[PDB]
Amino acid sequence: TSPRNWCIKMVCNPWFECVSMLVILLNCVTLGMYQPCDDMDCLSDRCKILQVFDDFIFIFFAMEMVLKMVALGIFGKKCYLGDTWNRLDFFIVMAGMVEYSLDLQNINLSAIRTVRVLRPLKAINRVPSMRILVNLLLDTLPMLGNVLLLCFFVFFIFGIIGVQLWAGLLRNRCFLEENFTIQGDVALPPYYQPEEDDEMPFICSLSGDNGIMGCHEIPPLKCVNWNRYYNVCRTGSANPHKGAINFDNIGYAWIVIFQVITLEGWVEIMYYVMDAHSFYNFIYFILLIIVGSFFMINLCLVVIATQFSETKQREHRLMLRETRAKLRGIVDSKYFNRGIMMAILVNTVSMGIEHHEQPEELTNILEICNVVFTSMFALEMILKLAAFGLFDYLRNPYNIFDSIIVIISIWEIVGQADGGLSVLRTFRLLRVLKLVRFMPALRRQLVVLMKTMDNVATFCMLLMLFIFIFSILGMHIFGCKFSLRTDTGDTVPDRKNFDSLLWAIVTVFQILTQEDWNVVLYNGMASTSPWASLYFVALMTFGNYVLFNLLVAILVEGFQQTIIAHKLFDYVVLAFIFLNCITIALERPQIEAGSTERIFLTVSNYIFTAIFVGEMTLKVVSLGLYFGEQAYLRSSWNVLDGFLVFVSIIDIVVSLASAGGAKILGVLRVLRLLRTLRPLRVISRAPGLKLVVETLISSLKPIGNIVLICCAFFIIFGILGVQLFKGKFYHCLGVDTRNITNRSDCMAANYRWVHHKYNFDNLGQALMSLFVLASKDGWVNIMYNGLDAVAVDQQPVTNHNPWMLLYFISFLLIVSFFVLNMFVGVVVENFHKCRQHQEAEEARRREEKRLRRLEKKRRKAQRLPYYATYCHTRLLIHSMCTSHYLDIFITFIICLNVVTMSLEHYNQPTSLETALKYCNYMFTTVFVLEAVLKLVAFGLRRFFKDRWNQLDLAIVLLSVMGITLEEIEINAALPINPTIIRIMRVLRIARVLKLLKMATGMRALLDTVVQALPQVGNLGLLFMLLFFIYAALGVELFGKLVCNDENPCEGMSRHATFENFGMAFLTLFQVSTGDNWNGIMKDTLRDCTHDERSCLSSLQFVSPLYFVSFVLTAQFVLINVVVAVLMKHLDDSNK
Ligand SMILES: CC(C)CCC[C@@H](C)[C@H]1CC[C@H]2[C@@H]3CC=C4C[C@@H](OC(=O)CCC(=O)O)CC[C@]4(C)[C@H]3CC[C@]12C
Ligand SMILES: CC(C)CCC[C@@H](C)[C@H]1CC[C@H]2[C@@H]3CC=C4C[C@@H](OC(=O)CCC(=O)O)CC[C@]4(C)[C@H]3CC[C@]12C
Ligand SMILES: CC(C)CCC[C@@H](C)[C@H]1CC[C@H]2[C@@H]3CC=C4C[C@@H](OC(=O)CCC(=O)O)CC[C@]4(C)[C@H]3CC[C@]12C
Ligand SMILES: *[C@@H]1O[C@H](CO)[C@@H](O)[C@H](O)[C@H]1NC(C)=O
Ligand SMILES: *[C@@H]1O[C@H](CO)[C@@H](O)[C@H](O)[C@H]1NC(C)=O
Ligand SMILES: [Ca+2]
Ligand SMILES: [Ca+2]
């Protein structure tokens, strides 16, 4: 109409969307300027100007809203409320109007002002690529409810189990005696805490609750041992982490289960529970890890990738002067090119050598060699411009980059006054990048990565929008509420605060990477309210388990003589190797010299070596050592077996050479390390594992180029870190660590000059610190050291140079991009091979599948025995009482059961106890009723043929078993062990399993997982083998590492030390989960008090290599498990 026609031209004008983006970004800038610490009631200048700015922003938002209503209509498809984001704009408009009205009404109510944080989200609609991507995500969300139902199942089951086991157990601190007598000056706290303010609480074990740490393990204070008076412990206090880690409610149990889904703070709460209730809760926590933290979030990855696959496909289916020429000859010689490669490579090596406290001669050699390299590069400059001409030299921009490098180097040499030595020397690293001009594979790989980034960029903007929104939300709700209290005369703010958008964004990025996100979880749950954990739950879930899986999907679909008998010899030698494994898992560094088991271990080594040399001889006489083709050493596995048996022989020889063992103890160490390497022939002696290892290697070449590029970036950033941080990672750890600046001040105080184990002095230490950074573990402390670092021998000061956040976070982003590229390369590599196999066997498989549709035709009507029950008083039972009208009742009763179990907590009302008793009676009675109903509906044939009525009968049998024991405590018929009652209650949870019948999506998805168990099981066996090998190897390397007060541990707390074997298997699992693995490797590399050779040994060479290699192999194995699940899911999508 005419009124509509007046404004449609302006509304449809792209100038309107341009000014919409302008004001959206201006609104983002206005939201970013909030200073929660300083903007107190907005009694400041910038507060007032920002209020005016936001006022104008809301005025324009209201104006554009009314313009679009009066130009497009309301409440219709063509109308304004047609697109989703228009409704969102209306939502912010309404919320802002409400906030403005309450501002007029003089009602502060700082909770609707916390809707401003949603205003940046409007930028999604006013960007085409962003709008398409977000619409695709919103369309793939409704198909994610299945894995969200899996999430609910394996959160609720573990929440019920946790609340039923450890309801309030975490609270029992160790108190003084009940009637305590003190002469005077009562300084004893009511209970015992090792650290101040219950930072590391002392959760005991109750009398009857067979924990481990039971108040007789108290640290003897070292006068009078005041600690021994903490005798009895009772369940009344605040519970650990300022009341944040407990199992009282089911919300708190869900918080803890989430904390172990993200694999952060796993061990701390694990040992909290072990202290509280029982040592055997490791089954609970390890099962939760394996099920949730790996089989859930990676099923989330699989589901998002798949759903985005056919959601891309669905939308896609809707559409569907004479010397100049002579001087060139020297250039294109293919050997001069290699000579300049060698020059550049040795220049890189020269830049890598520099370290802290250089010898005076060494830096001179470095600068002279720099001059030589700059002279050679300038010679190439002048040569190529002459022999080619100006245009030809400038035709290729690689030569332009070379000229830039030469100019910068020359200026650096010339600029010997100031400034040049600070930046241009740091710019020397550009010469490393000249290799791209030469390596042919790293051109194609880099171009492919840029082709990917052609799709990543919009998703990067989406991620930045998301992180900005949540950083603003954090500033709003956590501003000035994270203030750590006074310890030196002032309440210094926590480093992971939310007081400024710089710190807000760094903290939100840190939370997304899952490093010390539990600390901010606790300090935001103990400051505002326990409901503040929803902030972190939403942040982590949308970021990691939705958005990052979305990016993975984006990339994946962007790409897409003597007699010989060999009947059971392999199987029997596999059994022998397993027995060898059993005796390898025993060589703990705790056996007394000459003990009974020591002799057994020696003789077992001898007999196993005899068996292996026997099979060696059998194989070689069957084949021949190297005597022609088809010999013993013509396969990789046979060569490995030969190497292992030869190592065992030479180790036995050296052991028999024990007489005069000096100077060969290192040789014994090396032979023992290879002895740990020994249990690896199971791969050779098994077909499935051998095939899987072959496939794992075949899936490593396609990502080999990306691995080389990422190692090159590690070297580049290592040299950069060496430049930036040389002697700056030294601090005076002492009583004060205050009012002191340089090391001379510390030596005046005589505290200590502590040298961090993670620092950038050498390039090897820089590379180890960079690997710790790039594993998104322990990287926050490294970053804090970087920002704090000041100079060679003075105290780092807090946030001295925040600009180094760029280094420490750009490294994380580049390594993350390369890791996602390795993951997608592995996925697409498996895709090709599995696709071929599919074609072939599935063509034959779709022949028999039409044969199976003919089988259903056959199925037909075999006079189904409904008549036998019809008119037999079951005329209603078989049909009218087995229909979906009767099973909705079962599902409703199950949901009521779920919400009843979700009500148990600590100190619950006894009235509520009896209410749950009656509800449980109701549920059990109706379950028995429906079991009888189906039993009379049909006879014993389908009773076991259904295979699900079996499940219902098992559930009702367990239920009636549980309820009967309750009556025993009413009539006091017999004293029943409370453990049996606990088992019955904790296994009442099995009534959830009946939801699996109607959740046909659960059946489909879990099945799709199930027919991946060939590959998943084989990789799991390989992964257990990796744990075995690396655990034995760690037992011998780090076994003698004593954990005590004299050696204050950081990562190996109580049962994670490498002392025994199993205590090393636990810590290898903990490293595999990436929880405080860097801490553990900090414990391993540690100069001791000369009490053992291990600290003073070559552990610096092998411990970082140990941990790095284990982390890499574990991650690769788990990635290939995920990939196998993904390809089986896509093959199921084919069928
Ligand atoms: C739906 C969830 C999973 C994602 C959406 C995130 C936010 C919309 C929610 C999740 C966490 C909630 C916060 C949890 C904690 C806080 C502090 C909490 O503490 C207070 O009572 C402060 C009272 C005051 O400041 O006067 C009040 C609710 C609030 C603001 C909540 C506001 C709304 C939040 C940020
Ligand atoms: C399947 C096999 C090839 C690998 C897995 C074997 C482990 C499950 C078993 C085999 C030997 C067992 C170890 C045998 C010896 C020890 C030392 C033992 O501690 C002590 O002897 C000191 C305390 C004391 O002496 O009473 C604790 C059990 C432990 C770690 C056992 C942990 C579990 C182990 C490693
Ligand atoms: C390639 C990325 C994925 C990981 C790189 C792993 C290794 C190549 C790095 C990590 C740990 C580094 C080692 C860490 C410790 C040292 C410091 C330095 O040893 C010293 O302290 C010298 C003084 C002395 O102890 O005598 C020699 C380099 C070295 C072996 C480093 C050599 C290079 C290592 C093995
Ligand atoms: C440190 O220096 C300050 C200077 O202001 C002084 O007041 C203080 O007594 C010194 N010592 C300690 C332990 O703080
Ligand atoms: C180190 O700090 C002290 C503080 O008393 C100062 O006097 C001195 O100049 C500083 N620098 C040195 C010792 O090189
Ligand atoms: Ca982690
Ligand atoms: Ca951590």
Numbering used by the authors: 66 to 287, 316 to 413, 627 to 866, 1164 to 1738
Q: What text comes from the article?
A:
The low-voltage activated T-type calcium channels regulate cellular excitability and oscillatory behavior of resting membrane potential which trigger many physiological events and have been implicated with many diseases. Here, we determine structures of the human T-type CaV3.3 channel, in the absence and presence of antihypertensive drug mibefradil, antispasmodic drug otilonium bromide and antipsychotic drug pimozide. The CaV3.3 channel consists of four repeated transmembrane domains, DI−DIV. Among them, the S1−S4 helices constitute the VSD; the S5 and S6 helices from all four domains form the ion-conducting pore; and the channel is formed in a domain-swapped fashion.
To improve the expression level and homogeneity of the protein sample, the N-terminal region (residues 1−42) and C-terminal region (residues 2065−2223) were truncated, and an incidental point mutation Glu523-to-Gln (E523Q) was included. Whole-cell patch-clamp experiment confirmed that these modifications on the CaV3.3 construct resulted in similar voltage dependency of the activation and steady-state inactivation compared to full-length wild-type CaV3.3. A total of 1135 residues were built into the final model. The selectivity filter ring contains four acidic residues, E357, E821, D1380, and D1678 (EEDD motif), one from each domain, and together they produce a strong negative charged area to attract cations and determines the selection specificity for Ca2+ ions. We identified a strong density inside the selectivity filter and close to the EEDD motif. We speculated that it represents a calcium ion, consistent with the previously observations in CaV channels structures. In addition, several phospholipids intrude into the central cavity from the fenestration sites around domain interfaces. The pore-lining helices (S6s) converged in the intracellular ends to form the intracellular gate. The pore profile calculated by the program HOLE34 indicated that this gate is closed in the apo state structure. CaV3.3 contains a long bended S6 helix from domain III, with a positive charged region protruding into the cytosol, which is critical for T-type CaV channel activation at low voltage.
